[PDB]
Write a protein that binds this ligand. Sequence first.
Ligand SMILES: [Mg+2]
Ligand SMILES: [Mg+2]
Ligand SMILES: [Mg+2]
Ligand SMILES: [Mg+2]
Ligand SMILES: [Mg+2]
Ligand SMILES: [Mg+2]
Ligand code: NA
Ligand code: NA
Ligand SMILES: [W+6]
Ligand SMILES: [W+6]
Lengths: 266, 265
Amino acid sequence: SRRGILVIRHGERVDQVFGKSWLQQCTTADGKYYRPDLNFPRSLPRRSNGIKDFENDPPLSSCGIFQARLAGEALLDSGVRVTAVFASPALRCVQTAKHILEELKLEKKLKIRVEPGIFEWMKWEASKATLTFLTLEELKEANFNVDLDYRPALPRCSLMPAESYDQYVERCAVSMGQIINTCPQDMGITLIVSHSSALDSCTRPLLGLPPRECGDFAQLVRKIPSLGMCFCEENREDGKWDLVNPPVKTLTHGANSVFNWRNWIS
Amino acid sequence: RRGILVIRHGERVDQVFGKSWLQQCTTADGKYYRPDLNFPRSLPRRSNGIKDFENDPPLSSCGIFQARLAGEALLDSGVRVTAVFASPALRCVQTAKHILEELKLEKKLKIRVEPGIFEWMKWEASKATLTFLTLEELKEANFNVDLDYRPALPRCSLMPAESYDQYVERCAVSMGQIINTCPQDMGITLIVSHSSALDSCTRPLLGLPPRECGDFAQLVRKIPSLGMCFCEENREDGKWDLVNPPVKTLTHGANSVFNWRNWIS
Ligand SMILES: [Mg+2]
Ligand SMILES: [Mg+2]
Ligand SMILES: [Mg+2]
Ligand SMILES: [Mg+2]
Ligand SMILES: [Mg+2]
Ligand SMILES: [Mg+2]
Ligand code: NA
Ligand code: NA
Ligand SMILES: [W+6]
Ligand SMILES: [W+6]
């Protein structure tokens, strides 16, 4: 058998669909959560500072949960052995990981290791996002089987708001370094649930390739669909990684437009 | 207050993968595979073989998700669902089933197949080459259909090619029956059908004449999957009011075709 690394982009986020005002849309006059569209999720997990810190840490939409579940179900069907799961500290990523594991039927067996070293390039994230993350206890209370004992390659408070592209790609290389060295003897698939950028930044170091030019890289991160996947396998006898077809198919689906019949006909 | 909720079927495999979708998921000798996750995990068995899916396609995976999300929202709304009628098109019976599953009512309420609320057979892409699953086939494939329900229109009667004026009369005829089938006991009746039905199954209830064909078509083409139209009955005043549906709308984005080879290297 061949050891594998499957890098997975998170499912659809609520703010991709509902835009910058999404949080004000689902907050009642009295400050409570409600669903003004069915693509808002059933609930939000409990957090520090109430509903207000979801600002730069949006959850999956109902469609994004579906995508994540559909991919976990396909993984179950495929027969592949999944041995570890690492997630970006971003809520959307931990949730995608949770839903994949639930459909693998492994949510109890495998703990999600939260790795800030595979968080988004800080350039593209709010400066105060480092301070936005759900803590591991908050996640645990919200029913996320998070590895409380995992020691990240890059702790969340070491993320630098002004990290350059060069610094970004380096800390992804180092994180993947540690991830690969957890137990180099395991022979199943490790999941890396992260951002569009990770499908490049987390695989190129494994492939022994130089970082992509920043501009080419920026154009590539636009092209990865929700739950988009990239799969690397290690050759046992020479220790070399190669890109191969992921163990499951792509997911292609249409949009659903906003609609009100009574409005429409006036 | 007695309500009627008209609901368009979820996303169809052929909306996303085109008319050749069946070629994409079947092997030389008719074996089904799943080339993309939006193809369903299996196809039910058909009397005249898979070829019949070309004019009677199933829901995509996204369509199933849409149906289930609406069922789950209906349950959360607290409304009481009395009855469920569905068009004989496979996509409609599938949408009905998945709604009922999330309402947790699929053992309790039987789906009543009504050929009278089938699509407009002018727009319909065929001639005399459309065959629905029989009730027996549907029950075989685990749809809790009502074997004892007597339809307003028999499926054999479906005039194989129709104009606009014929379609709207038929829908009005059938809705008359459906309003008479149900016992006086209120709650909500689900009518799982096509996008054209949100107008053609409501205008007759509202005592309203049909729209000019261009005006109808223009409005109808913009109904999304699981799009809803809701009419409540004023029993003392003997007439129907078009009202806000008991569940919110569903907005989501697409997921585009991805080829890792084109990008990751
Ligand atoms: Mg084991
Ligand atoms: Mg913490
Ligand atoms: Mg820079
Ligand atoms: Mg609107
Ligand atoms: Mg086409
Ligand atoms: Mg492509
Ligand atoms: Na995005
Ligand atoms: Na259509
Ligand atoms: W992203
Ligand atoms: W349709």
